[PDB]
């Protein structure tokens, strides 16, 4: 992924953990060799895969339990690193955020050309819930949907539900989350 993600791995780690840790994990995954994440450039997957499967193992915590914790940094990070005008352009709720991301990624796109983002389809219920249905080149990250979404929750001052009622790995085409909301 584009190294913003992995600079954010960084700083979610180093300013929950302290800098040592980070330095630890750092060498674990086996990324000793790069001094700094570059924000605007291309990475391997790979990398961001290693950085928490490393930080898994360093912090005794489930890699799923990170990737829900890195999602709810994600929404405040990237608000304060220069993105929180193009955040503001999508919304001032839930719903509306989520229907505005297809088209907020085909915004960064120009921009970055090697980016693979998400497909997300909403499914209106009622006006307090939603199914969501998540498709991606990427495996494993559902996690991390199930932490951006309550980053959102917390980012419009809205009470979050948030369920998986398919998962890719029961077998099923792509997952899909079952959403309540205030
Ligand atoms: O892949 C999967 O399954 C999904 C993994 C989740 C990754 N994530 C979900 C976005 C999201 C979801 C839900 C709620 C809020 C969200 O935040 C909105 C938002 C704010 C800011 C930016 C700046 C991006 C940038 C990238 C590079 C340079 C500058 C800016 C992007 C998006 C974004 C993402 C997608 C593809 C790639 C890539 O392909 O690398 C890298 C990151």
């Given at each position: ?13 180093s ?6 840790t980070?330095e630890?994990i750092?060498?674990?995954?086996g ?5 700094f994440?570059?924000?605007?450039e291309?990475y ?6 290693h950085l928490?499967?490393?930080?898994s ?5 489930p890699?799923?339990?990170?990737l ?11 608000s ?18 989520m ?7 085909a ?31 990427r ?8 932490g951006?979404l309550h ?10 539900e ?6 890719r ?14």
């Amino acid at each position: 992924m584009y190294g913003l993600v992995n600079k954010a791995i960084q700083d979610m780690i180093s300013k929950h953990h302290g800098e040592d840790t980070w330095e630890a994990i750092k060498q674990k995954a086996g990324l000793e060799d790069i001094d700094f994440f570059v924000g605007m450039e291309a990475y391997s997957d790979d990398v961001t895969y290693h950085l928490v499967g490393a930080a898994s193992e360093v912090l005794g915590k489930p890699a799923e339990e990170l990737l829900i914790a890195f999602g709810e940094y994600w929404v405040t990070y990237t608000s304060e690193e220069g993105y929180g005008e193009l955040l503001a352009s999508a919304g001032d709720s839930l719903p509306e955020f989520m229907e505005n991301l297809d088209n907020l990624h085909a915004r960064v796109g120009l921009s970055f050309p090697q980016l693979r983002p998400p497909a997300f389809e909403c499914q209106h219920t009622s006006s307090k819930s939603m199914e969501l249905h998540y498709q991606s080149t990427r495996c494993g990250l559902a996690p991390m949907v199930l932490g951006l979404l309550h980053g959102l929750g917390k980012r419009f001052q809205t009470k979050v539900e948030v369920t998986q009622t398919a998962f890719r790995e029961t077998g099923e085409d792509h997952d899909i989350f079952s959403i309540k909301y205030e």
